[PDB]
Write a protein that binds this ligand. Structure first.
Ligand SMILES: [Zn+2]
Length: 195
């Protein structure tokens, strides 16, 4: 099977938002609206905003999962490569095999689906704080898109779903992600190629 990637705002008007970081050669994370693609360095903070028109119920959660973008690779579980899964860089909560981690949230839970074998990380949805209009989750990608034996240069999509306490779908959004050495340069090159 393959997780759905269909955009769905749902009853709460759920959608993602990204900061405007630019494309300076030194940038560590940058999002391209034209390509709906996030470019980031290995294990660097990727701020992802959660926007809703109305607050969902207490117990609502937010899950992140990666899948290969190419249809011929969609059924393959996206996981860290043979080298990174063994580098003992766990933060004490994320299994070393997981590509996507959530930073600074002790309530993050990591799932290895007993049926699909796919990996995901989920946190409780927290409503915006005083003075804020949105909620931000900080993600880290733990392998480069080019890692051999892992993503192996194949592009991936990250699917973010808003779920109820039972795991039922409330909202869904997604974006392509490239983990690379120079996000600014690659974003500039890909947007140029699109033009
Ligand atoms: Zn790797």
């Amino acid at each position: 099977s393959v997780p759905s990637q269909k955009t769905y705002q749902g009853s709460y008007g759920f959608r993602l938002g990204f900061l405007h970081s630019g494309t300076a050669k030194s940038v560590t994370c940058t999002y391209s609206p034209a390509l709906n693609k996030l470019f980031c360095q290995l294990a660097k903070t990727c701020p992802v905003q959660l926007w809703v028109d109305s607050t969902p119920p207490p117990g609502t959660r937010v899950r992140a999962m990666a899948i290969y973008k190419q249809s011929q690779h969609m059924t393959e579980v996206v996981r860290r490569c043979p080298h990174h899964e063994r580098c003992s860089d766990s933060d004490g909560l994320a299994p070393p095999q997981h590509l996507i981690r959530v930073e600074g949230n002790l309530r993050a839970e990591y799932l290895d689906d007993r049926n699909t074998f796919r990996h995901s990380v989920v946190v409780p949805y927290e409503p915006p704080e005083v003075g804020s209009d949105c909620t931000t989750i900080h993600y880290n990608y733990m392998c480069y898109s080019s890692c051999m034996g892992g993503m192996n240069r194949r592009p991936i999509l990250t699917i973010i779903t808003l779920e109820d306490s039972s795991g039922n779908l409330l909202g869904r959004d997604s974006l392509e992600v490239r983990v690379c050495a120079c996000p600014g340069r690659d974003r500039r090159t890909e947007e140029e190629n699109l033009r």
